[PDB]
Structures are given as C-alpha cells and as structure tokens.
Amino acid sequence: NSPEVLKMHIPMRHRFLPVQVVGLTYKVPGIFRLGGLDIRLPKEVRYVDGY
Amino acid sequence: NSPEVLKMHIPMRHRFLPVQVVGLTYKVPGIFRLGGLDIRLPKEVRYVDGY
Amino acid sequence: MAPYNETYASDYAFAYEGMVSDIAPADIISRTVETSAGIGFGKIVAQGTSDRGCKADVSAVSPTAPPLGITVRSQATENLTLDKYPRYDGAAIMRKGVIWVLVTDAGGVVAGDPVWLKKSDGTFSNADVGSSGGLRLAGCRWDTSAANGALARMRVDFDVPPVAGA
Amino acid sequence: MAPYNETYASDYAFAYEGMVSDIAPADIISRTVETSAGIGFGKIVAQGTSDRGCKADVSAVSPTAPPLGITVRSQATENLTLDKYPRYDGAAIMRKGVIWVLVTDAGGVVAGDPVWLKKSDGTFSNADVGSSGGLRLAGCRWDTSAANGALARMRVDFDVPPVAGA
Amino acid sequence: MAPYNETYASDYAFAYEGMVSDIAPADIISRTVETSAGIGFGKIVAQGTSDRGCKADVSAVSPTAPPLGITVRSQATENLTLDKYPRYDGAAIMRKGVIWVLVTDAGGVVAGDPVWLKKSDGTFSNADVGSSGGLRLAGCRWDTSAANGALARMRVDFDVPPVAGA
C-alpha cells in the first residue's frame, strides 16, 4: 500500500459540456477521461486462495 | 482581352457561417456563389494548334 | 423517509422501462392515445383511427399495416395513471433511436439478434412463435445480453417494412 | 389589390404542392436539374447521367436502379418558370422527412397505406397498377386521409430498396 | 523541411482513406477494438464478442449476422500505430453518413451502383464475386466515378438487412 507499488491516473475527472437543443429536447453530454490501475512492483502483492 | 468580349461575374465571395455542434462534433459550413465564364464575341478568340 | 422496497443493491441499476440512451438522431412523434386505459412506457403501438391517434392493440398488424413505433418514458403524465399515457394525451412515439425495453424470452437475448414481435400480447423476443402469430421487425437489433424478464436496449428503425413469419 | 381567384374559403388551406412539415431529421440533397423543361416541386426524380444530376423521367426505374428522391418547394426559383426548378439549377432533393404530395387514386388514401409509384407518369397511389408498370416504395407511408386530386402528407425513406410488382 | 514524397501535383487531392463529407445526419458509434493488430480507417467491421466490441474479421458475416459499420478517420490515435485504431480503443463506427472508401474493382465504379462486399478480405466492389463469398449491402450506393484502387465516396445505411448472393 505505497504510491511506489500501486498507482491510478485520472487526468480528467468529470466534465459537463454545453447543452444542445433538438426539437423540444435538451441533451447535456458528460465526459470523463481516466486510465487503468498500475501495479509496478508485482513481487510486493500476493494472492492466497482457498481460505 | 476586353470586358465586351469576355466576362465573368462573381457577385459573392467566400464567407463562413457559424458553427453547428452535434454530439461532440463541430460541423462548420462555408459558402459562395459565382457565374460561369461568358465569351460574348466568339470571332474575337482564335485557337492555333500544333505549335 | 420511506424505506419500503429497500433491497440494498450492490450498485446502480441500468435503466427503467422506456428510457432512451442519448444519441444525435431520434424521430420522436406526437400521437394521441386512443385506448380507454392508458399505454405503458416501453410498448409498441399501432395506427389509430383518428388520423393521428394510436392504440396499444397490435393484434392485427401485418406487412400491409405495419406497427407505428414505441412510446418513451415521459415522467410528466397526469399523476393519476402511475406510469402510463392517459387517454387523450400526447404519446411521444419513437422510431429511430436506441431504447430500453423488456425481454420476454426463455433463453434470453445476446448482442446481435433479430427482434420478433408477438402479436397476441405485443412482447419482444428472439425467435418466431411459430403459429402465424409473430412478425419480424426487419430493421431492428438488440444491443445487450439479458436474461428473461430483464431490461435490454435495442436499436430500432421502423421505416423498413416488417416480415411475416408463419 | 388583386381579387381574382377569390373563393371565400371557410378557413386556411393545409399546405402547398411540395412544402415540408417541421421535424428534426431531413436529408436534403443538392442535385442539378437535367431535363430541358423544369421540374415541379412535389415530384419524384431519377438518377441523372452527370454523376450529380437528376431527371424528371422515371419511366425506367427498377429495383436495380431505384429512384433518387422528391424535390421540395424552394420559393426562390428564377421567376421565369412559375413553380419549377429551371434547367441547370440546384434541386434540393429530400429523402427522409415528411412531405406534402398530390394524390392520384380513385378511392383516395387513409392514414397507413403502402405507397405505389406509377412509372408511366410518376404519380403516387395506394395500390399497384397491374401491368408491370408500378413500383412499391418499400419504406414509405401516408399520414393523412385524402380524396382524389388532393394534398396528403407522407413519410418517406429512400434507403430501403423498392419492390417490383407485376 | 521534408521534401520526400514530392509529386508536384496539378491540384489538391480529393480526400483520405476514411474521411467523411459534411452532412446533417450521422450515426457515429463508439466501439472497442478487439483485434490484436489495429483496424484501418476506412474499413468494415463485424460484431465483437464483448457486447460492445468489434473485429476487423468479416469472413463469417451473413444475413443473419450483418456487419456492424465502417470506421472513420480519427487523427488522434496513439501515434504508435500509423493510421489505425490500436487494441482496446474507441473505434467511432459510422453507419448513416457519406464516407470516402477505397475501390477494389477491375473496371471501376460509376455514380449509382450496388455495393458488394467480398467476405474473404473485406473489400468493396461493383458486382458479386460469384462463389458464395460476397454479400450485397442492400442500402448503400456510390457517389463518384473512380478507377481501380482509387478513393470514391459512398452513401451508407446499415439498418437495411444485407442480401446473400451465390
């Protein structure tokens, strides 16, 4: 559980863009831009099965 | 090479119109309008081939 | 502070009966409800007799008289019928977008399947019933794998004529 | 102060020959008129020989060579042809919306009917002519009950291939 | 100051492999790339196994399992694959607009032609191959006359079911 074992990068959190009106309907699109989880040191994480 | 032998009218030149936005895409138009070339005196133009 | 119907769900659900999923195109059409009782939200509708009306009775649709479309969840509907379009009301039919509907099939559906309508009740399924009581909505496809009696989103196009299947 | 052609009508008329009715989607397509005479407003058109042209002659359309679309009422059209697109002009073809057209049928049409094209003249009707001279525009339907020689609005989709009927 | 691949062209070219041409409607759909290698820009794609994925392998498409659409030129694609969508990436499939694609036919194509897909490689052509190895994309048409191995724009509609041709 240290930042040098695990990391997770989220460049963009969550964004609301302007509203676009199409014939008595309003549509607001929301976008968020993130990456995956990274385990840099795999020898410092251990799985044990069957407990 | 006189305005009474050849003539080309271009009433409107190229301009741009505002931006339309549709689902994360910015579509932008742009228009103009012209008129084709007009050779009024065809005996005052001569073609020589084979030079 | 109403805690009834608490199921302590693992995470959020997917959608409701007739909710749409955002996309640029959608033909949404205003019709007037003709049935004495209302019409549910994610339901198929036929062509009414009022030249702009619709009925929930699709027991007589054919390739010559195709169905009209599918209603959408409005959320402002007179609060006397729970989740329905009351009689004499704008219906908001949809015939181009992608919409969540209810599955009625034993084995469920997967991503790309034909959509078959059972004329007897007006339920959507994966395969033909087998007694000249089902139509195939020619331009239509699923977009989610779902089990029996669950919500799945499908893509719909009602300008393509239906196909009769015996 | 022109009072000719005064009929003292009870109320306003419905539409004109080729006017559209508002809706979110519409494929409007720019083509160049190829016929020596113009092309009327609510008319069908075929595929020209100029790779972007159109002709008003649809006597040879088939399922292999489907018709192109329907022209729309422009209201800015060179004032030398009364209500037409002159030769060598942008045509504004439509192939997705809902448009008012002219009915040519003995018994008239009602809300949901097939649309049949008579290849001889290029007129719309309810049923097939019966001598291998009619096509069915597969994705098309009416939206108004109208008598013979009256205006009715129809919903049109030209991406669905036509059906030949003998 | 890179002058390699200078051909001193007479005038500007027409388009690139998968660029679109502006028009009001377009279904652009987000899918995830499933093939180990990427997927090119103007290419056909099939329905993946991930319920929202796509594959570049269309060797097994049928009228029962129609193809999904055509990818579009994105211009922001990870700069490790030259002009492709890398594995595990949003694909931006298109199924309604007009798109520039590559011609694979001996005699070329002209304005209005059928579009035939060769299932073996996934190339577009004018006529059927002739050994139960080609499909016809029923709602599709060309929009440019072009020679062999050149770019031509075509209009596409993938809701119309394909037609098998032996």
XYZ file of C-alpha atoms in Angstrom:
600
model
C 0.000 0.000 0.000
C 2.509 2.640 -1.057
C 2.386 5.036 -4.026
C 5.512 3.242 -5.327
C 3.634 -0.106 -5.539
C 0.232 0.956 -6.856
C -0.929 3.940 -8.834
C -4.011 5.106 -10.702
C -4.015 8.088 -13.056
C -7.151 10.144 -13.709
C -6.247 13.126 -15.934
C -9.816 14.428 -16.328
C -12.306 13.985 -13.501
C -15.769 14.706 -14.939
C -16.951 17.434 -17.263
C -20.262 18.867 -18.428
C -20.403 20.314 -21.932
C -22.871 22.900 -23.261
C -26.487 21.941 -23.864
C -27.707 21.294 -27.414
C -31.401 21.740 -28.187
C -33.060 19.480 -30.763
C -36.810 19.930 -31.137
C -38.212 20.277 -27.604
C -35.440 18.147 -26.088
C -32.264 19.197 -24.271
C -29.197 16.943 -24.268
C -26.253 17.600 -21.944
C -23.271 15.288 -22.577
C -20.823 14.473 -19.785
C -17.312 13.132 -20.305
C -14.509 11.902 -18.049
C -11.071 10.697 -19.072
C -9.195 8.194 -16.908
C -6.674 5.385 -17.142
C -6.196 1.973 -15.595
C -4.700 0.688 -12.369
C -0.945 0.106 -12.385
C 0.905 -2.400 -10.190
C 4.556 -1.502 -10.682
C 6.060 -3.916 -8.159
C 4.322 -7.287 -8.657
C 6.521 -9.074 -6.106
C 5.046 -6.949 -3.288
C 1.472 -8.166 -3.880
C 0.450 -11.714 -3.006
C -2.710 -13.737 -3.669
C -3.689 -16.668 -1.465
C -6.680 -18.779 -2.487
C -8.898 -21.253 -0.695
C -9.342 -19.612 2.716
C -8.957 40.981 -73.718
C -11.815 43.458 -73.354
C -14.784 43.449 -70.940
C -17.056 43.348 -74.010
C -15.513 40.092 -75.302
C -15.017 38.117 -72.075
C -16.914 38.446 -68.816
C -17.104 36.533 -65.536
C -19.411 37.684 -62.740
C -18.669 36.847 -59.111
C -21.402 38.526 -57.022
C -20.464 36.955 -53.677
C -17.059 35.901 -52.365
C -16.208 33.152 -49.888
C -17.572 33.676 -46.374
C -18.031 31.455 -43.335
C -21.138 30.656 -41.306
C -21.453 29.983 -37.560
C -20.580 26.643 -36.001
C -23.133 23.876 -35.530
C -22.478 21.430 -32.688
C -23.714 17.833 -32.783
C -22.681 15.169 -30.274
C -19.008 16.002 -29.667
C -18.516 17.161 -33.280
C -18.262 20.743 -34.548
C -19.642 20.976 -38.094
C -18.779 24.287 -39.788
C -20.176 25.383 -43.181
C -18.935 27.955 -45.698
C -20.468 29.106 -48.987
C -20.005 31.373 -52.006
C -21.589 31.968 -55.397
C -20.303 32.847 -58.871
C -21.314 32.713 -62.523
C -19.632 30.848 -65.339
C -17.344 32.489 -67.868
C -19.105 34.093 -70.818
C -17.466 34.557 -74.229
C -19.714 37.080 -75.951
C -17.791 37.598 -79.203
C -16.526 34.163 -80.331
C -14.894 35.507 -83.514
C -12.551 37.633 -81.370
C -10.923 34.499 -79.912
C -8.782 32.214 -82.066
C -7.096 28.874 -81.384
C -3.874 27.816 -83.109
C -2.887 24.185 -82.584
C 0.354 22.400 -83.351
C 2.999 24.872 -82.153
C -38.138 8.856 4.836
C -39.680 5.919 3.010
C -37.585 2.756 3.360
C -40.046 0.275 1.850
C -38.846 -1.668 -1.189
C -35.254 -1.462 0.043
C -33.108 -4.194 -1.484
C -29.620 -2.926 -0.561
C -28.458 -3.230 -4.142
C -24.787 -3.781 -4.981
C -24.694 -0.869 -7.433
C -26.969 1.299 -9.554
C -29.428 -0.285 -11.951
C -29.154 0.148 -15.697
C -32.330 1.962 -16.796
C -36.119 1.984 -16.454
C -38.885 0.601 -18.646
C -38.853 3.077 -21.515
C -35.894 5.394 -21.018
C -33.754 6.332 -24.029
C -29.971 6.476 -24.358
C -28.505 9.671 -25.780
C -27.615 9.812 -29.471
C -27.806 12.518 -32.116
C -30.737 11.185 -34.220
C -34.235 10.473 -32.962
C -37.638 10.610 -34.623
C -39.952 11.392 -31.740
C -43.543 11.662 -32.930
C -46.559 13.171 -31.188
C -49.657 10.962 -31.277
C -52.891 10.950 -29.289
C -53.721 7.967 -27.088
C -56.900 6.195 -28.169
C -57.210 3.221 -25.802
C -59.626 3.537 -22.890
C -56.904 2.603 -20.427
C -53.521 4.228 -20.812
C -50.456 2.956 -22.632
C -47.300 1.844 -20.860
C -43.937 3.440 -21.436
C -41.872 0.896 -23.299
C -44.597 -0.555 -25.511
C -45.414 -0.988 -29.181
C -48.304 0.933 -30.752
C -50.442 0.585 -33.872
C -52.034 3.114 -36.195
C -55.195 4.645 -34.768
C -58.453 5.554 -36.447
C -58.201 9.296 -35.720
C -55.580 10.007 -38.443
C -53.126 10.912 -35.691
C -54.093 8.501 -32.905
C -52.518 5.315 -31.633
C -53.748 2.166 -29.928
C -51.967 -0.337 -27.711
C -53.737 -3.188 -29.543
C -51.375 -4.708 -32.111
C -53.228 -7.983 -32.585
C -53.958 -7.210 -36.258
C -50.694 -5.732 -37.565
C -49.410 -7.098 -40.875
C -46.791 -6.234 -43.517
C -49.567 -4.205 -45.164
C -50.384 -2.390 -41.881
C -47.051 -2.098 -40.059
C -46.782 -1.000 -36.424
C -46.217 2.666 -35.718
C -43.433 2.831 -33.131
C -42.546 2.622 -29.445
C -43.550 5.010 -26.663
C -40.972 6.690 -24.422
C -40.818 7.424 -20.698
C -42.200 10.936 -20.209
C -42.159 11.457 -16.401
C -44.852 14.200 -16.608
C -48.058 12.219 -17.120
C -51.076 13.445 -15.103
C -50.149 11.505 -11.874
C -53.484 9.642 -11.947
C -52.185 6.733 -14.011
C -48.971 5.581 -12.398
C -46.623 5.089 -15.360
C -48.834 5.439 -18.443
C -50.062 7.938 -21.037
C -53.704 8.636 -20.117
C -56.496 8.703 -22.659
C -56.395 11.755 -24.939
C -52.741 12.655 -24.390
C -49.610 13.299 -26.403
C -47.836 9.981 -26.729
C -44.265 10.748 -27.906
C -43.620 7.749 -30.156
C -40.019 6.967 -31.141
C -38.956 5.111 -34.276
C -35.225 5.725 -34.858
C -33.225 5.868 -31.620
C -31.982 3.280 -29.141
C -34.399 2.456 -26.326
C -34.541 0.209 -23.266
C -37.314 -2.393 -23.429
C -38.409 -5.540 -21.601
C -37.359 -9.026 -22.725
C -39.870 -11.892 -22.981
C -37.894 -14.986 -23.979
C -36.952 -18.233 -22.268
C -33.243 -18.286 -23.095
C -32.674 -14.540 -23.208
C -31.002 -12.499 -25.928
C -27.438 -11.563 -26.870
C -25.817 -8.631 -28.673
C -26.937 -9.021 -32.272
C -30.243 -10.831 -32.711
C -33.417 -10.440 -34.741
C -36.351 -8.804 -32.985
C -39.620 -10.724 -33.159
C -42.963 -9.280 -32.080
C -45.686 -11.498 -30.645
C -48.944 -10.055 -31.985
C -51.048 -11.699 -29.260
C -49.694 -9.569 -26.395
C -47.154 -7.259 -28.017
C -43.944 -8.574 -26.473
C -40.457 -8.678 -27.966
C -38.422 -11.858 -28.284
C -35.565 -13.527 -30.134
C -37.295 -16.121 -32.343
C -40.650 -16.594 -34.052
C -43.562 -18.064 -32.100
C -44.489 -20.498 -34.866
C -48.249 -20.205 -35.480
C -48.574 -17.177 -37.806
C -48.792 -15.040 -34.674
C -45.429 -13.301 -34.875
C -43.851 -10.593 -37.006
C -40.209 -9.741 -37.575
C -39.350 -6.061 -37.295
C -36.942 -6.137 -40.217
C -34.813 -3.169 -39.255
C -34.197 -3.731 -35.535
C -31.476 -5.278 -33.420
C -30.526 -5.821 -29.801
C -27.628 -4.170 -28.031
C -27.322 -6.020 -24.704
C -27.236 -9.572 -23.421
C -30.093 -10.029 -20.960
C -31.961 -12.856 -19.258
C -35.714 -13.448 -19.130
C -37.816 -10.561 -17.853
C -34.937 -8.074 -17.740
C -34.244 -4.747 -19.423
C -32.248 -4.681 -22.651
C -31.561 -1.790 -25.002
C -32.336 -2.200 -28.685
C -31.788 -0.125 -31.818
C -34.928 0.441 -33.861
C -35.821 1.604 -37.360
C -39.475 1.473 -38.339
C -39.245 2.632 -41.961
C -38.108 -0.847 -43.049
C -41.234 -2.921 -43.785
C -41.889 -5.868 -41.452
C -41.658 -9.518 -42.466
C -44.454 -12.006 -41.820
C -43.408 -15.355 -40.401
C -45.597 -18.446 -40.179
C -55.396 44.799 -54.842
C -55.859 41.644 -56.882
C -59.156 39.905 -56.099
C -59.113 37.320 -58.895
C -59.241 33.673 -57.833
C -61.206 34.605 -54.713
C -63.141 31.634 -53.357
C -64.124 32.968 -49.910
C -62.747 29.885 -48.220
C -64.102 28.710 -44.862
C -60.637 28.521 -43.292
C -56.970 28.262 -44.218
C -55.774 25.515 -46.525
C -53.423 22.789 -45.366
C -50.243 23.167 -47.446
C -48.936 23.634 -50.989
C -47.592 21.188 -53.553
C -44.180 20.409 -52.101
C -43.956 22.066 -48.699
C -42.396 20.141 -45.803
C -43.587 19.785 -42.213
C -41.047 20.523 -39.493
C -39.181 17.634 -37.879
C -35.643 17.184 -36.601
C -34.249 14.844 -39.317
C -34.109 15.580 -43.028
C -31.724 14.504 -45.769
C -31.905 17.380 -48.217
C -29.621 16.771 -51.183
C -28.350 19.212 -53.796
C -28.675 17.950 -57.373
C -28.555 19.677 -60.751
C -31.637 19.656 -62.972
C -31.047 17.875 -66.273
C -34.422 17.968 -68.046
C -34.916 20.586 -70.750
C -38.066 21.846 -69.066
C -38.002 22.363 -65.331
C -39.079 20.002 -62.575
C -42.130 20.584 -60.412
C -41.969 20.933 -56.665
C -43.543 17.814 -55.251
C -42.252 15.308 -57.798
C -40.141 12.171 -57.949
C -36.725 12.225 -59.634
C -34.350 9.638 -61.082
C -30.576 9.403 -61.215
C -29.051 11.614 -63.889
C -26.158 10.988 -66.236
C -23.980 13.821 -64.883
C -22.935 11.964 -61.681
C -24.822 14.580 -59.680
C -27.775 15.377 -61.951
C -31.414 14.382 -61.841
C -34.174 13.886 -64.385
C -37.946 14.045 -64.046
C -38.256 10.948 -66.266
C -38.803 7.876 -64.089
C -40.163 5.603 -66.806
C -37.216 3.190 -66.468
C -36.682 2.891 -62.702
C -36.272 -0.626 -61.313
C -35.164 -2.327 -58.076
C -31.672 -2.272 -59.607
C -31.926 1.474 -60.407
C -34.067 2.938 -57.618
C -35.465 6.477 -57.737
C -33.451 9.233 -56.121
C -35.907 11.254 -54.031
C -38.516 14.011 -54.037
C -37.997 17.715 -54.717
C -39.082 20.389 -52.234
C -40.748 23.785 -52.601
C -37.959 26.366 -52.781
C -39.782 29.704 -53.339
C -36.632 31.330 -54.842
C -36.508 29.877 -58.354
C -35.597 32.366 -61.122
C -39.207 33.709 -61.585
C -39.199 32.682 -65.263
C -40.618 29.218 -64.636
C -43.633 29.648 -62.401
C -43.211 26.886 -59.809
C -40.326 24.755 -61.095
C -36.559 24.269 -60.851
C -35.156 25.595 -64.146
C -32.557 23.750 -66.171
C -29.093 23.784 -64.582
C -30.194 24.593 -61.031
C -29.804 23.234 -57.529
C -32.702 20.881 -56.957
C -32.875 20.240 -53.177
C -33.997 16.605 -53.143
C -35.408 15.177 -49.900
C -35.366 11.512 -48.914
C -36.052 11.243 -45.162
C -38.588 13.807 -43.933
C -42.358 14.147 -44.171
C -43.617 15.997 -47.243
C -46.932 17.073 -48.755
C -47.623 15.499 -52.152
C -50.505 15.097 -54.594
C -52.784 12.042 -54.582
C -53.715 10.222 -57.810
C -56.147 7.460 -56.839
C -59.832 6.807 -57.421
C -60.851 5.939 -53.862
C -58.313 8.093 -52.048
C -55.941 7.091 -49.267
C -56.126 6.739 -45.486
C -53.618 7.006 -42.636
C -51.398 3.966 -43.068
C -51.152 2.678 -46.627
C -48.463 1.455 -48.998
C -47.142 3.982 -51.496
C -47.142 2.836 -55.115
C -45.410 4.726 -57.916
C -46.762 4.652 -61.461
C -43.677 4.618 -63.693
C -45.597 5.885 -66.736
C -46.235 9.388 -65.352
C -44.640 9.378 -61.907
C -47.729 9.654 -59.718
C -48.317 8.238 -56.245
C -51.220 5.962 -55.390
C -52.483 3.346 -52.952
C -52.406 0.102 -54.973
C -50.452 -1.382 -57.867
C -51.486 -0.583 -61.438
C -51.291 -4.211 -62.551
C -49.253 -4.340 -65.782
C -45.615 -4.337 -64.582
C -45.784 -0.546 -64.695
C -45.736 0.188 -60.974
C -43.185 0.062 -58.175
C -43.675 -0.048 -54.425
C -41.521 2.364 -52.448
C -40.847 -0.117 -49.667
C -40.097 2.343 -46.901
C -42.875 4.927 -47.281
C -46.267 5.539 -45.736
C -49.102 8.038 -45.782
C -50.063 10.307 -42.920
C -53.422 11.812 -43.941
C -56.749 10.674 -45.327
C -57.365 12.489 -48.605
C -59.644 12.217 -51.626
C -58.671 12.138 -55.300
C -56.501 15.002 -56.512
C -55.903 16.461 -53.048
C -52.817 17.107 -50.943
C -51.702 14.489 -48.430
C -48.543 14.341 -46.342
C -46.426 11.205 -46.444
C -43.353 9.947 -44.602
C -40.543 8.819 -46.880
C -37.352 6.788 -46.594
C -35.452 6.106 -49.799
C -32.634 3.922 -48.458
C -34.960 0.896 -48.371
C -34.805 -0.798 -51.796
C -38.006 -0.700 -53.869
C -40.144 -3.726 -54.687
C -41.209 -4.587 -58.230
C -44.842 -5.539 -58.693
C -46.335 -7.131 -61.795
C 11.635 20.904 -44.421
C 10.830 17.400 -45.604
C 10.594 17.191 -49.401
C 10.405 13.404 -49.752
C 7.320 12.014 -51.481
C 7.004 15.183 -53.560
C 4.994 14.573 -56.722
C 4.346 18.174 -57.833
C 0.638 17.514 -58.131
C -1.535 19.535 -60.512
C -4.066 20.401 -57.802
C -5.289 19.245 -54.405
C -6.369 15.658 -53.882
C -9.939 14.728 -53.055
C -9.842 13.089 -49.606
C -8.029 10.492 -47.499
C -8.815 6.878 -46.676
C -11.666 7.291 -44.211
C -12.585 10.967 -44.104
C -16.266 11.952 -44.051
C -18.080 14.646 -46.023
C -20.237 17.052 -44.037
C -23.975 16.416 -43.803
C -26.551 16.885 -41.064
C -27.199 13.213 -40.124
C -24.599 10.733 -38.927
C -24.782 7.743 -36.606
C -21.296 7.592 -35.152
C -20.983 4.718 -32.697
C -18.327 4.065 -30.067
C -16.989 0.502 -30.076
C -13.890 -1.108 -28.591
C -11.290 -2.641 -30.897
C -10.865 -6.374 -30.342
C -8.320 -7.464 -32.966
C -4.728 -7.952 -31.836
C -3.476 -5.624 -34.548
C -5.308 -2.372 -35.089
C -8.076 -1.573 -37.545
C -7.613 0.710 -40.529
C -9.611 3.861 -41.050
C -11.910 3.177 -43.957
C -12.726 -0.456 -43.208
C -15.719 -2.653 -42.473
C -16.177 -4.196 -39.021
C -18.151 -7.094 -37.561
C -19.863 -7.621 -34.226
C -17.437 -8.481 -31.442
C -17.759 -10.923 -28.578
C -17.519 -8.282 -25.826
C -21.110 -6.978 -26.277
C -19.644 -3.661 -27.405
C -16.506 -4.743 -29.273
C -15.692 -5.001 -32.948
C -13.373 -7.103 -35.079
C -11.834 -6.463 -38.483
C -12.561 -10.084 -39.470
C -15.712 -10.215 -41.598
C -15.128 -13.645 -43.108
C -18.261 -15.074 -41.448
C -20.879 -12.334 -41.885
C -24.294 -13.425 -43.152
C -27.823 -12.003 -43.495
C -28.404 -13.429 -40.005
C -25.237 -11.744 -38.636
C -24.917 -8.496 -40.597
C -21.797 -6.319 -40.481
C -21.693 -3.505 -37.964
C -20.446 -0.443 -39.848
C -17.410 1.433 -41.143
C -14.677 3.131 -39.119
C -13.797 6.801 -39.606
C -10.517 8.717 -39.731
C -9.826 9.954 -36.199
C -6.408 11.693 -36.448
C -5.768 11.276 -32.674
C -4.793 7.612 -32.368
C -1.859 6.893 -30.010
C 0.893 7.618 -32.646
C 2.309 4.092 -32.246
C 0.160 2.567 -34.977
C 0.461 4.811 -38.003
C -3.136 5.126 -39.228
C -5.106 2.596 -37.172
C -7.206 2.215 -34.020
C -4.983 0.332 -31.550
C -6.207 -2.582 -29.483
C -8.595 -1.564 -26.694
C -9.618 1.804 -28.132
C -12.755 3.700 -29.046
C -13.469 2.920 -32.670
C -16.026 5.514 -33.877
C -18.079 3.395 -36.278
C -20.339 5.175 -38.785
C -23.464 3.702 -40.353
C -25.528 6.540 -41.872
C -23.373 9.264 -43.439
C -21.377 9.561 -46.650
C -17.776 8.370 -46.423
C -14.728 8.083 -48.672
C -13.551 4.496 -49.171
C -11.174 2.538 -51.396
C -12.315 0.843 -54.612
C -11.306 -2.743 -55.457
C -12.731 -3.494 -58.902
C -11.261 -4.082 -62.343
C -13.482 -1.740 -64.349
C -14.135 0.823 -61.632
C -17.461 2.221 -60.473
C -19.815 4.994 -61.580
C -22.361 7.216 -59.828
C -25.172 4.853 -58.898
C -24.106 1.244 -58.409
C -24.738 -1.568 -55.951
C -22.111 -2.081 -53.268
C -20.808 -5.631 -52.932
C -18.623 -6.803 -50.057
C -16.040 -9.540 -50.545
C -16.097 -11.543 -47.308
C -12.631 -13.019 -47.904
C -10.733 -9.738 -47.437
C -13.422 -7.150 -46.740
C -13.171 -5.031 -49.881
C -15.907 -3.123 -51.689
C -16.730 -3.633 -55.350
C -19.408 -3.227 -58.004
C -20.516 -6.809 -58.741
C -20.708 -10.139 -56.931
C -17.642 -12.383 -56.797
C -19.592 -15.496 -57.766
C -18.688 -18.266 -55.294
C -20.947 -17.587 -52.275
C -18.184 -15.341 -50.959
C -19.851 -11.967 -51.428
C -22.659 -10.029 -49.778
C -24.696 -7.111 -51.060
C -25.099 -4.233 -48.625
C -28.718 -3.616 -49.558
C -28.940 0.013 -48.532
C -25.735 1.501 -49.966
C -24.747 3.340 -53.113
C -21.769 5.044 -54.702
C -21.443 8.756 -55.312
C -18.363 9.122 -57.542
C -16.916 7.578 -60.672
C -13.495 6.155 -59.838
C -10.953 3.779 -61.345
C -9.298 0.769 -59.718
C -7.549 1.411 -56.416
C -8.802 4.987 -56.061
C -10.903 6.814 -53.486
C -14.650 7.102 -54.018
C -17.321 8.424 -51.677
C -20.345 6.268 -50.945
C -23.606 6.722 -49.053
C -24.277 4.031 -46.470
C -27.223 2.777 -44.435
C -26.657 -0.301 -42.304
C -30.159 -0.791 -40.886
C -31.302 -2.407 -44.151
C -30.558 -6.150 -43.927
C -27.910 -7.487 -46.328
C -28.611 -9.830 -49.229
C -26.696 -13.066 -49.760
C -25.523 -13.747 -53.293
C -24.186 -17.055 -54.583
